[PDB]
Amino acid sequence: YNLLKGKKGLIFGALNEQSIAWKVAERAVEEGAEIVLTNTAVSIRMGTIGRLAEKCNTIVVPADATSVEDLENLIDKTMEHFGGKFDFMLHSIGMSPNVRKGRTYDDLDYDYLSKTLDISAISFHKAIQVARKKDAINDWGSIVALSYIAAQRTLYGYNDMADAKALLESIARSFGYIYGREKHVRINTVSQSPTPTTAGSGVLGMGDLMNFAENMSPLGNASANDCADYVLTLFSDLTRKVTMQNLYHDGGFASMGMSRRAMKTYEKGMRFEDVHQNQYPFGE
Amino acid sequence: YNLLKGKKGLIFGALNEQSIAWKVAERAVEEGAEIVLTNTAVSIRMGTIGRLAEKCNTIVVPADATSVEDLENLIDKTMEHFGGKFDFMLHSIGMSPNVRKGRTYDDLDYDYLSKTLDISAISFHKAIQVARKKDAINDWGSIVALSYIAAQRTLYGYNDMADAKALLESIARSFGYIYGREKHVRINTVSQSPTPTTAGSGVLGMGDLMNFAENMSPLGNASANDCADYVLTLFSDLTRKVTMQNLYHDGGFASMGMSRRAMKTYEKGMRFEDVHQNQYPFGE
Amino acid sequence: YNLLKGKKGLIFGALNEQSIAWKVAERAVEEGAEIVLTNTAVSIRMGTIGRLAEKCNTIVVPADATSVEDLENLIDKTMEHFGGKFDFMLHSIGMSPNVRKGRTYDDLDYDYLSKTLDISAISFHKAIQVARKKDAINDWGSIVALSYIAAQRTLYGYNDMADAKALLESIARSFGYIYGREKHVRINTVSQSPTPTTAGSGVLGMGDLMNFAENMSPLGNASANDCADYVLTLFSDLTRKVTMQNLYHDGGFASMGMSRRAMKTYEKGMRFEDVHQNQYPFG
Amino acid sequence: SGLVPRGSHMAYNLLKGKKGLIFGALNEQSIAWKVAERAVEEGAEIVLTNTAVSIRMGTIGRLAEKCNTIVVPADATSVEDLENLIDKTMEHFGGKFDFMLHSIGMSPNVRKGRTYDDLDYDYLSKTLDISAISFHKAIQVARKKDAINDWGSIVALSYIAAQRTLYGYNDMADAKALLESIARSFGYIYGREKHVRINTVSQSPTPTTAGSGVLGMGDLMNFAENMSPLGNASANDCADYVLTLFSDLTRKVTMQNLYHDGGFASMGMSRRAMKTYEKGMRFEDVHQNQYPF
Ligand SMILES: NC(=O)C1=CN([C@@H]2O[C@H](COP(=O)(O)OP(=O)(O)OC[C@H]3O[C@@H](n4cnc5c(N)ncnc54)[C@H](O)[C@@H]3O)[C@@H](O)[C@H]2O)C=CC1
Ligand SMILES: NC(=O)C1=CN([C@@H]2O[C@H](COP(=O)(O)OP(=O)(O)OC[C@H]3O[C@@H](n4cnc5c(N)ncnc54)[C@H](O)[C@@H]3O)[C@@H](O)[C@H]2O)C=CC1
Ligand SMILES: NC(=O)C1=CN([C@@H]2O[C@H](COP(=O)(O)OP(=O)(O)OC[C@H]3O[C@@H](n4cnc5c(N)ncnc54)[C@H](O)[C@@H]3O)[C@@H](O)[C@H]2O)C=CC1
Ligand SMILES: NC(=O)C1=CN([C@@H]2O[C@H](COP(=O)(O)OP(=O)(O)OC[C@H]3O[C@@H](n4cnc5c(N)ncnc54)[C@H](O)[C@@H]3O)[C@@H](O)[C@H]2O)C=CC1
Ligand SMILES: [Cl-]
Numbered sequence A, B: 001y002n003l004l005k006g007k008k009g010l011i012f013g014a015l016n017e018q019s020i021a022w023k024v025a026e027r028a029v030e031e032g033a034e035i036v037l038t039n040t041a042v043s044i045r046m047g048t049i050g051r052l053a054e055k056c057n058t059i060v061v062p063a064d065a066t067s068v069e070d071l072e073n074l075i076d077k078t079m080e081h082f083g084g085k086f087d088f089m090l091h092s093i094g095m096s097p098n099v100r101k102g103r104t105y106d107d108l109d110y111d112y113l114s115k116t117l118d119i120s121a122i123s124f125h126k127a128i129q130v131a132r133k134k135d136a137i138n139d140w141g142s143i144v145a146l147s148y149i150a151a152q153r154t155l156y157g158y159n160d161m162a163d164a165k166a167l168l169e170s171i172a173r174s175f176g177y178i179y180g181r182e183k184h185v186r187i188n189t190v191s192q193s194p195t196p197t198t199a200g201s202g203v204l205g206m207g208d209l210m211n212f213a214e215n216m217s218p219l220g221n222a223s224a225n226d227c228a229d230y231v232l233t234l235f236s237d238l239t240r241k242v243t244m245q246n247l248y249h250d251g252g253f254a255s256m257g258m259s260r261r262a263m264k265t266y267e268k269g270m271r272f273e274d275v276h277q278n279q280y281p282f283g284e
Numbered sequence C: 001y002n003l004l005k006g007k008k009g010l011i012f013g014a015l016n017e018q019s020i021a022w023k024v025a026e027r028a029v030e031e032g033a034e035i036v037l038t039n040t041a042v043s044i045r046m047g048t049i050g051r052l053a054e055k056c057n058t059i060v061v062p063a064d065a066t067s068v069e070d071l072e073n074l075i076d077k078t079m080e081h082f083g084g085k086f087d088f089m090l091h092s093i094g095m096s097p098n099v100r101k102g103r104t105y106d107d108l109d110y111d112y113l114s115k116t117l118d119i120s121a122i123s124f125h126k127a128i129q130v131a132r133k134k135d136a137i138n139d140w141g142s143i144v145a146l147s148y149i150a151a152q153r154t155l156y157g158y159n160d161m162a163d164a165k166a167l168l169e170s171i172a173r174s175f176g177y178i179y180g181r182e183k184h185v186r187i188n189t190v191s192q193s194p195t196p197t198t199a200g201s202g203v204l205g206m207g208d209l210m211n212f213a214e215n216m217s218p219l220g221n222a223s224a225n226d227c228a229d230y231v232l233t234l235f236s237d238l239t240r241k242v243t244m245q246n247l248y249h250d251g252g253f254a255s256m257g258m259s260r261r262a263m264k265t266y267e268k269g270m271r272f273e274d275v276h277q278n279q280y281p282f283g
Numbered sequence D: 001s002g003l004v005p006r007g008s009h010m011a012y013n014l015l016k017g018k019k020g021l022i023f024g025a026l027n028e029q030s031i032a033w034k035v036a037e038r039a040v041e042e043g044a045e046i047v048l049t050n051t052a053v054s055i056r057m058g059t060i061g062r063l064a065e066k067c068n069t070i071v072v073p074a075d076a077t078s079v080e081d082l083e084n085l086i087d088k089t090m091e092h093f094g095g096k097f098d099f100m101l102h103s104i105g106m107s108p109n110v111r112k113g114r115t116y117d118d119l120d121y122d123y124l125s126k127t128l129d130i131s132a133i134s135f136h137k138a139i140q141v142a143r144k145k146d147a148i149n150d151w152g153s154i155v156a157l158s159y160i161a162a163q164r165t166l167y168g169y170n171d172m173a174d175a176k177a178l179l180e181s182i183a184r185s186f187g188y189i190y191g192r193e194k195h196v197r198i199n200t201v202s203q204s205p206t207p208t209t210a211g212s213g214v215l216g217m218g219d220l221m222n223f224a225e226n227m228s229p230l231g232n233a234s235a236n237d238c239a240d241y242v243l244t245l246f247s248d249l250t251r252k253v254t255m256q257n258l259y260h261d262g263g264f265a266s267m268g269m270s271r272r273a274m275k276t277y278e279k280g281m282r283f284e285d286v287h288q289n290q291y292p293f
Helices: A021-028 A041-046 A048-054 A068-083 A108-131 A158-185 A206-216 A224-235 B022-028 B040-048 B051-054 B066-081 B110-133 B159-184 B205-215 B224-235 C019-030 C039-045 C049-055 C068-082 C110-133 C160-182 C206-216 C224-237 D031-041 D054-058 D060-066 D079-093 D122-146 D171-194 D217-227 D235-245
Strands: A008-012 A033-037 A060-062 A086-091 A137-147 A185-191 A246-249 A256-257 B008-010 B035-039 B060-062 B086-091 B137-147 B186-192 B246-250 B256-258 C010-011 C034-037 C058-064 C086-091 C137-149 C186-192 C246-249 C257-258 D020-023 D045-050 D071-073 D097-102 D147-158 D197-203 D255-260 D267-269
Touching: A008 A021, A008 A068, A021 A033, A021 A048, A021 A086, A021 A224, A033 A048, A041 A060, A041 B186, A048 A060, A060 A068, A068 A086, A068 A108, A068 A206, A086 A224, A086 B246, A108 A137, A108 A158, A108 D122, A108 D171, A137 A158, A158 A185, A158 D122, A158 D171, A185 B110, A185 C034, A206 B256, A224 A246, A256 B205, A256 C246, B008 B022, B022 B051, B022 B086, B022 B224, B035 B051, B035 B066, B040 B051, B040 C110, B040 D020, B051 B060, B060 B066, B060 B110, B066 B086, B066 B110, B086 B110, B086 B224, B110 B137, B110 B159, B110 C110, B110 C160, B137 B159, B137 B224, B159 B186, B159 C110, B159 C160, B186 B224, B224 B246, C010 C019, C010 C068, C019 C034, C019 C049, C019 C224, C034 C049, C034 C068, C039 C049, C039 C058, C049 C058, C058 C068, C068 C086, C068 C110, C086 C110, C110 C137, C110 C160, C137 C160, C137 C224, C160 C186, C160 D147, C186 C224, C206 D267, C224 C246, C246 D197, C257 D217, D020 D031, D020 D079, D031 D045, D031 D060, D031 D097, D031 D235, D045 D060, D045 D079, D054 D060, D054 D071, D060 D071, D071 D079, D079 D097, D079 D122, D097 D122, D097 D235, D097 D267, D122 D147, D147 D235, D171 D197, D197 D235, D235 D255
Parallel strands: A008 A033, A008 A086, A033 A060, A086 A137, A137 A185, A185 A246, B008 B035, B008 B086, B035 B060, B086 B137, B137 B186, B186 B246, C010 C034, C010 C086, C034 C058, C086 C137, C137 C186, C186 C246, D020 D045, D020 D097, D045 D071, D097 D147, D147 D197, D197 D255
Antiparallel strands: none
């Protein structure tokens, strides 16, 4: 569509070809954008962002998004790369040392929790505050962070990441009010389906949680590729009046109370009794 | 507790001893309130409200809550009975001819739908408008309607009643703004668990829907007795600053994304892996 | 962008060049869609939709969206025009006889309220039910209705239309579950800024309400043209996994509790004390 | 006009036989002070707690005397202090108790006049710890010691900045969003196990020590007042609402964020909030009572 022709952007969090940020990167460049990539020194070494950088004809700047100093260096190197200001920024970063080290929500380590909140939420505030201090972002620019419905409605096992996502979504509102009134920069969260990614694979019983979400979601779970398509609309000029929103991209999960497929009495091929026609939507 | 000592109220919708309004009536009188009861002529003949009125030492005034003329007579008869104004009013009325006659949501009769919205929602506006025109309600009075989470999140089978509840909840906001600023009268909805009542029994697959909600709700489903206890707090002086709220009374259902019990892989006695202690909350 | 190349759509409610539906129609055809237009016989005679049909190289099918018979005819004529099924549908319809006749929320006529709810909300269920019975909509198709935040939070004067919008948004969820699981058709509401349209000009003190929302919204109110741009995304393949959503398109109004500009004590030129830099965002 | 009528004593014995732990009573203006007084009038036994510094600078000693109980010093960010607090509370009651009020909030960023676009991130860490994580710390310690009876009730105080942005409210808005999530996360666990309910009360802007620290609090309270059809809720009003949540009557209410704000949370635009409105202007949205004030 050439949706982002002439646009420049900074993308965090592309680890491997499964990463939501990897798909956003590829699609942004396919749609005419120029991008800069960033990840931690460890993720650069252990994943395949080098191949993405090659495909997108750009550079990878190492940064820890919890380090104001690293973020300052990143914005300088990004603005140097572009020869000035850029239009869009994707925060696609999440990690809990509690989840990683198998600490349960009722037995948290509070030093771990501090890192969960810093990596998964405060990093967004740190990126925006540094970018804004350096005036890195053009008027009518677009900032997105990826979030999850555990921020609003509890999911068994999701642990301290649920609370981190509630904090992340609040920062989008808090900083969105400031950046919008000044420079018409919109800031939104995209609340994505459970998705098969490195960070996703660390969620307790993720395969079973994904099946639950699939059964609840009338359109089924959104893929990482689907998410990239949606994020492209938020980077495009067509969403210039959308700000401070938490935007569910989940095939309807957020709006569902009880699907037929989620019921324990349901088996595939049972007749749907809530409709007069198409009573076998998943076949006989 | 004598929570409603000196208070006078009008209770709609007591059909039989299963009715949420029946429990609210019993409990209101136990807590020192004087009440007036109303139902349709047909429901008075077909149900047991006569026995409740005997227990509560009061009158039953026949009224169709879709009839402004019946509501005018009801308010006159209520104020005559009390010798003037009263403090609280319970709307506990719901019916869909589409649900009763097995019309599905994709095959509605639109005359039936008009009646669903009239009985289940517009009757609330009619009751408040007629009461307020006759200045029937004391300053710092309390008006409650009973609603259901389908108003926000879709449940398989719930049909046109979901849309009616969304409409009912909006009327509580719209009229609450007016009655609050004028006479400090609070207007709220209580969003109750799925409950075994005459109206509840008409819901598609209600037993299985109740089972789903019970698995999703950490405290379990609320009974009609539990709901009456909660409604008593809204009629009491202790909630005088709570208005235009939709209050979930549901053992946590509204705030749950996915419980362990709701998962198809779960069986009774399986160890919970989201906690360090009490891993068998439902026994081994 | 060619965002809607090869797509076909039915657009309700284009009255005149200020209508949100008029802007959606222009922008849909600019983006490569083919459309069919509809409005009431009265609106076709009193408005300028004929001019839009000419610019969009298409037909105007008369229909009362409260009439199942008229919707059945409309969907037949639309499918005949396209030679089969279509991809998107815009519901852009609202009217309150209570508001029009100066009846206040505390003194409703209940026959007028029944018409408000029919025109403003039930018409959306009627359109979807008829279309679905005729299998009118392609898999991965997109249905949008225009709504307003009065559905969630009370605005002085907005009257029975607030209640109608809550009902409208519920229909999107109820029907969205069914059409989604069957044919992957998404159904969403766009909750738009107060906008200077014919319907908008009927709102009690619309000018003052629009100024309140402008001051509360950090990006400012969304225009009808801005709204048309957003609706384009929902008809595009890029939003295929977005359904049963009420989507605030309002420059941030829905997420604001209190802006500096909303405060009685604020005057244009006062220093913003909540930031370290850009303390004069409005000069 | 919005001042709720009081005078005659309300004695409902709502909390007769119940035992509670109350955080955050600094002085007679504190919401937690009102909750403590009202809980004892309704028949409860309480234990009080605050920081060493707050105990020394404030008047909690007076409250402790009125409520015939002890003040246990504790920094609610310290797991060790909370472990001590829960042991001293259970020793005082001779076992488990029924309710706990978290009424704690402070931002070093707000106190030091650091703005949201120029946060100190060590200060932010402390805002989040004091204002939100402390609630997790208190529930985790209490639950590990099985301190709370079946059908018990835990409440924390929050503010609508958690959902809708208010000019100047700063990093406390984000802290309140985190606090309300902890209520849901821990409510699921404590509910399913022992039917212990956990809720937040989202209160009006209130003239307290912590409240007076909010940038232009006077002007924010006036905006909320004009936007709230019943007017702002007082600390006394909030205490009355919290009593219902500690009472048996709310046993099926959990993981809720409960707005106690005279309707502020459900309002889009009040007539009073509009710049064109002056006292005594006719309301045109109604046919009757067009001069409601
Ligand atoms: N996979 C899922 O189910 C869902 C994921 N999300 C969110 O999407 C975002 C991206 O994650 P995914 O693509 O799923 O997984 P991923 O594992 O591909 O990406 C996570 C990224 O976070 C980066 N990261 C970790 N710590 C960092 C630090 N200190 N500084 C900078 N970067 C750091 C990692 O290097 C990695 O590139 C996360 O916020 C995640 O929570 C949201 C909803 C669902
Ligand atoms: N049972 C459930 O699962 C739930 C019920 N509710 C609501 O609680 C309210 C009370 O219903 P329940 O006690 O469950 O059932 P119920 O069958 O005991 O009460 C329904 C009442 O509505 C009355 N009614 C019907 N048409 C009427 C008319 N035209 N005018 C006046 N009254 C009329 C009936 O006579 C009956 O007394 C209803 O609004 C229902 O939707 C809310 C949440 C869940
Ligand atoms: N103007 C505003 O401030 C806002 C408007 N909206 C909504 O946008 C939609 C379109 O209205 P606007 O473009 O603002 O005004 P408009 O006056 O340009 O369009 C309203 C349309 O509804 C049509 N209509 C009325 N009765 C009808 C019937 N029985 N059948 C079929 N069509 C009928 C009219 O003919 C007209 O074309 C409405 O739902 C409105 O409530 C939503 C948010 C804000
Ligand atoms: N006043 C207002 O406008 C509103 C206040 N709230 C909340 O109500 C709660 C109570 O505050 P208020 O009664 O308004 O003010 P307050 O100043 O009377 O109470 C705040 C309390 O927090 C305590 N505290 C501070 N740091 C602590 C620590 N490390 N450990 C233990 N305690 C500590 C203070 O000693 C004090 O007792 C707070 O969570 C506040 O944010 C909620 C909504 C509105
Ligand atoms: Cl399903």
